[PDB]
Amino acid sequence: LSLFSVNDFTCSQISPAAIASNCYSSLILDYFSYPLSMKSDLSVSSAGP
Amino acid sequence: QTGFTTTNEAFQKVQDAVNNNAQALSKLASELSNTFGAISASIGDIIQRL
Numbered sequence A: 001l002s003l004f005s006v007n008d009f010t011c012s013q014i015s016p017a018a019i020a021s022n023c024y025s026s027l028i029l030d031y032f033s034y035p036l037s038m039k040s041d042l043s044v045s046s047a048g049p
Numbered sequence B: 001q002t003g004f005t006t007t008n009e010a011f012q013k014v015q016d017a018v019n020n021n022a023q024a025l026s027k028l029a030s031e032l033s034n035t036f037g038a039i040s041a042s043i044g045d046i047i048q049r050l
Helices: B011-031
Strands: none
Touching: none
């Protein structure tokens, strides 16, 4: 994460410190190209396309 | 003297009392010390996630 400039970091059911330190079974990290204009559409609770 | 088996439903009443208070104690108090809504599950998410 230090190689980039994170514009938004919101952790649900998990804390930003824990998501760096806790252990579990499996990590899934999905990435794509996303403009900062449609940040509001990128949420679990939204009616955006 | 010989018979204290299942047919004796006065002995079975003793067993009922014993099982009754045993299950009131252990089963109920322990299984209700487990999980409630779902996510908390055990502790309260003190560090494990939250």
